[PDB]
Amino acid sequence: GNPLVYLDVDANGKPLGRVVLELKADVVPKTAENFRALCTGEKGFGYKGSTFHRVIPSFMCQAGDFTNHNGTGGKSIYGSRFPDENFTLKHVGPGVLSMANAGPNTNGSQFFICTIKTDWLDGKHVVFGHVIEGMDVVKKIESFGSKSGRTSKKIVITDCGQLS
Ligand SMILES: Cc1c(C(=O)NCc2ccc(N)cc2)cnc2cc(=O)[nH]n12
């Protein structure tokens, strides 16, 4: 079945709880596998210890730059970047999990969780999963963002992994 993975998130060193994500490997297997392996850390690198560096209320929470911690970095398990697998899944509402990018075919490790329907991203960002549990944690993260994306608390993925 599709992988279930988790992110345990702190804000200014206090735990907020756990976000559980389903990865739609049946639709986007290569994109799902990248995220799964970055959660487990099994390639020797991944999301553990990295941050939500860009958070915009009423839009999304973005994370996954585990190399530069600022939106310029990250890498995939395949290499620095990998192609857009497909655009079949849509940005239908809060809880959608999608790949950040710098244009076509520039997926790495950065990702975002939507807090609203973001239909204008359809066909531009690869959707690959959704929140199963922990939308309350996502809403807390969102509340620590700003219009500019700068966070008002340090939001850290302290632990992450695969549940099934
Ligand atoms: C524009 C931007 C990006 C961005 O698009 N980075 C390019 C990129 C994405 C994914 C991969 N894998 C590689 C490169 C990342 N963070 C922030 C914060 C902010 O205020 N603007 N911003």
Swiss-Prot record:
Keywords: Acetylation, Apoptosis, Isomerase, Mitochondrion, Necrosis, Rotamase, S-nitrosylation, Transit peptide. The chain holds residues 44 to 207 of 207 of the full protein. GO terms for cellular component: cytoplasm; membrane; mitochondrial matrix; mitochondrial permeability transition pore complex; mitochondrion. The modification N6-succinyllysine is found at K24, K43, I132, K147. One of its GO terms (biological process) is mitochondrial outer membrane permeabilization involved in programmed cell death. Belongs to the cyclophilin-type PPIase family. Changing C160S: Blocks Ca(2+)-induced mPTP opening and reduces hydrogen peroxide-induced cell death. This is Peptidyl-prolyl cis-trans isomerase F, mitochondrial. The modification N6-acetyllysine is found at K24, K124. Acetylated at Lys-124; deacetylated at Lys-124 by SIRT3. It is found in: Mitochondrion matrix. Associates with the mitochondrial membrane ATP synthase F(1)F(0) ATP synthase; the association is increased by inorganic phosphate (Pi) and decreased by cyclosporin A (CsA). Interacts with ATP5F1B; ATP5PD and ATP5PO. Interacts with SLC25A3; the interaction is impaired by CsA. Interacts with BCL2; the interaction is impaired by CsA. Interacts with TP53; the association implicates preferentially tetrameric TP53, is induced by oxidative stress and is impaired by CsA. Interacts with C1QBP. Interacts with MCUR1. It catalyses: [protein]-peptidylproline (omega=180) = [protein]-peptidylproline (omega=0). Its EC number is 5.2.1.8. It comes from Homo sapiens. Inhibited by cyclosporin A (CsA). Is displaced by CsA from the mPTP leading to a lower open probability of the mPTP. It is an enzyme of class 5 (isomerase). One of its GO terms (molecular function) is peptidyl-prolyl cis-trans isomerase activity. PPIase that catalyzes the cis-trans isomerization of proline imidic peptide bonds in oligopeptides and may therefore assist protein folding. Involved in regulation of the mitochondrial permeability transition pore (mPTP). It is proposed that its association with the mPTP is masking a binding site for inhibiting inorganic phosphate (Pi) and promotes the open probability of the mPTP leading to apoptosis or necrosis; the requirement of the PPIase activity for this function is debated. In cooperation with mitochondrial p53/TP53 is involved in activating oxidative stress-induced necrosis. The modification S-nitrosocysteine is found at C160.
